[PDB]
Ligand binder design. Structure first.
Ligand code: HEC
Ligand code: HEC
Ligand code: HEC
Ligand code: DXC
Length: 71
């Protein structure tokens, strides 16, 4: 399957799966979540544990605006 881009108005956000599969062997951080995770995602989650927060906790991955968002 293909990578997805989130159409944030300030700039597209790429989500490269290959890097995540390699760097996050605990697949259940994202997969086999209960129902509601597709509807639930948004800016609050993205800027929290959905994206940025995991990067902070794992000590790796982008944490600056322009590292995630790109027109
Ligand atoms: C969130 C940050 C994820 C982590 C950590 C892992 N996966 Fe993932 N996966 C995630 C998304 C948002 C998607 C759909 C978009 C995409 O890039 O495909 C997927 C997709 C898969 C797939 C289908 C891949 C394909 O057909 O090309 C598989 C088989 C899969 N994910 C498995 C998987 C495993 C085994 C992981 C841990 C090592 C893993 N994923 C991490 C989100 C995230
Ligand atoms: C842990 C549970 C994570 C979640 C949820 C998300 N990301 Fe992530 N990401 C994670 C790690 C440990 C890393 C480092 C990977 C590396 O090899 O350096 C990353 C990396 C990225 C990257 C950069 C990939 C690269 O080629 O360097 C991007 C662009 C990125 N992450 C974006 C991103 C987004 C948009 C997420 C939410 C939708 C997201 N990540 C979730 C760990 C985790
Ligand atoms: C990745 C780890 C990110 C970092 C660092 C920052 N942002 Fe972000 N942002 C990210 C995603 C995946 C999303 C989309 C949420 C979704 O609905 O899918 C966003 C969202 C925004 C928005 C809202 C965009 C919209 O609703 O169209 C804004 C205005 C925004 N982000 C700005 C922003 C700034 C200023 C940042 C640095 C302070 C920043 N983001 C960091 C992913 C990530
Ligand atoms: C559920 C995990 C981990 C975050 C958490 O613990 O809640 C999060 C991390 C990244 C999230 C995905 C990012 C891309 C997509 C954004 C859509 O708007 C909703 C579906 C997708 C496919 C999201 C589904 C789910 O919300 C994920 C996989």
């Amino acid at each position: 399957a293909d990578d997805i881009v989130l159409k944030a108005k300030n700039g597209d956000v790429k989500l490269p799966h290959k890097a995540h599969q390699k760097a996050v062997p605990d697949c259940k951080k994202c997969h086999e979540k209960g129902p509601g995770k597709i509807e639930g995602f948004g800016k609050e989650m993205a800027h929290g544990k959905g994206c940025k927060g995991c990067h902070e906790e794992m000590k790796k991955g982008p944490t600056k605006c322009g590292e995630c968002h790109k027109k």
